[PDB]
Amino acid sequence: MQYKLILNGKTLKGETTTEAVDAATAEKVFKQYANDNGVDGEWTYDDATKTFTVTE
Structure with a gap:
């Protein structure tokens, strides 16, 4: 039930x-x-993986 959000990109990263x-x-x-x-x-x-992530 737990999901993780990962942020990527050129100069944009976050977890x-x-x-x-x-x-x-x-x-x-x-x-x-x-x-x-x-x-x-x-x-x-x-x-x-019921997980959501965003990659640029």
Whole structure:
């Protein structure tokens, strides 16, 4: 139920950790992380790893 947020890019790197009931809940807030951190990259979603990460 725990998901991790990783931020990469050229000069933009960051790591995050959050806990929720499900990814559906984390997904909405997670997207805010990128938006909150004007991050523009590629997003991936794994059901087995229920983890969200953004790579530019």
